[PDB]
Amino acid sequence: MHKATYKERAATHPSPVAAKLFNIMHEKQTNLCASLDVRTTKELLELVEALGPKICLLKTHVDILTDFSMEGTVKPLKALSAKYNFLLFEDRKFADIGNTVKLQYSAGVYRIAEWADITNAHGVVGPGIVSGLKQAAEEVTKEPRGLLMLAELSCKGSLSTGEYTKGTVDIAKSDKDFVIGFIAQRDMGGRDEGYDWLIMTPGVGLDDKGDALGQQYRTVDDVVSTGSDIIIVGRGLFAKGRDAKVEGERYRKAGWEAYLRRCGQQD
Amino acid sequence: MHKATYKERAATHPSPVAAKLFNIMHEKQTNLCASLDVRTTKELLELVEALGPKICLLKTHVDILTDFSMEGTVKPLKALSAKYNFLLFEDRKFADIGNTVKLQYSAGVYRIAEWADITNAHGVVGPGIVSGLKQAAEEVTKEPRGLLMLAELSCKGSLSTGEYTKGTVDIAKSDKDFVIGFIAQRDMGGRDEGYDWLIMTPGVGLDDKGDALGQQYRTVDDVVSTGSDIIIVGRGLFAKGRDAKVEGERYRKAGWEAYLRRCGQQD
């Protein structure tokens, strides 16, 4: 009843960026995504240098940086991304359509589509966000890009209804070549209909209590056995004295073992 | 059955920024918001210089600019804003919460909260966006700021249900001191419960057909008599040879007359 191995999914997946990510995960034996919300490029680059070998993906907020620059921050980041073999996911949460999102994604100061392998978008705005972002990507690079939809929100007061969630899943179905999966807490199905969605889930800990300030609350084994493909960990990797290199290996091993263990299911 | 005059609403409104905009509208006799989506700062500043006298608000997308800078673009824009007495509305459509939106709004490269009098936000994310943006504003300026909610979307395939729209309207009620109103096509009510929402509506023409490429389709008189407080006009003001100064006065008059005519209603 479980999912195929990352190796098998990489070979079957219709999306070049997802096939690439699955291959990274299998190669490096990691399903850990690092979320390093620091304010300076120096901090980011140092932390990324330390986690590089232990991650398959880096979730970023360059718009949170106090000293962002294409030369000073993106250039070095892409270098680390190529050197340690991991992808970049700018967590911008696009929620617009037409020419405006195309430019907010491909141009402006951040020129996101030029370097970020993956981004995410809200469903409220409709399928025009998928086609808009897809076209904008095709215009600025030959490099593969992918999109993650936010079908279900966990914040309090969210208007993310089941009807809303189904509406966003429906948008994700617009095309499996571009929409890679979802940022979710559980499986979003779709296997019956020929979709292999990547499930990336935030709020993960080895210390369920919430020892890490990155907002962790469910354990690695918990989410991974629930159908989660990638674990997004933040503060728990570098917060308060922790050695990023030590914590990256700690979470990587937890996640990978939970994954291998899940491959041993039959139901 | 109509609304009070702008002058009266300015005197009663709980929101400083809304009271300020209502006074600008009455003083200058305009309810025209200019939407100038150009790619260079030079173009923008020239156009704004020309429309300055005829508008009450300028809706911007500085993240679309090809050469944005705090000194080269924001500094001169605020100068025009003060010289010609109109407010700045950055159409960023925030859709996140917590510390991330606080910084996407108050810091980063655009430092939006430092100069934009008004911004907008989606409802899916819950009331945390209202409180987050409000707090972020209070921390970077002493100047009054305001928020417009996007309760009902008009794009095709939008998941903006009646239930969703009610959920967003409900979030707007979180506090009438910060949430100024909505970007909408029709009245959103609330007068019965003591709310005086500013209704700003895009896609307006004198030429219903769609002569302006700013995506115009309903006439000024149509929307203003429907309860629309501000008309957002884009390409129809400067597109294809048109003289901005001439078109600005054209729409300003159509909008102001429709308003005065609306004040003459009784039902």
Swiss-Prot record, chains A, B:
Pfam families, per the entry: OMPdecase
EC code: 4.1.1.23
Protein's pathway: Pyrimidine metabolism; UMP biosynthesis via de novo pathway; UMP from orotate: step 2/2
Mutation effect (residue 59 to A): Reduces kcat 100-fold. Reduces substrate affinity 900-fold
InterPro entries: Aldolase_TIM, OMPdecase, OMPdecase_AS, OMPdeCOase_dom, RibuloseP-bd_barrel
Position(s), cross-link Glycyl lysine isopeptide (Lys-Gly) (interchain with G-Cter in ubiquitin): 93, 209, 253
GO term, biological process aspect, one: 'de novo' UMP biosynthetic process
Keyword tags: Acetylation, Decarboxylase, Isopeptide bond, Lyase, Pyrimidine biosynthesis, Ubl conjugation
Recorded GO MF terms: orotidine-5'-phosphate decarboxylase activity
Catalytic activity, reaction form: orotidine 5'-phosphate + H(+) = UMP + CO2
Annotated family: Belongs to the OMP decarboxylase family.
NCBIfam families in alphabetical order: pyrF
Record protein name field: Orotidine 5'-phosphate decarboxylase
Organism: Saccharomyces cerevisiae (strain ATCC 204508 / S288c)
Upper classification of the organism: Eukaryota, Fungi, Dikarya, Ascomycota, Saccharomycotina
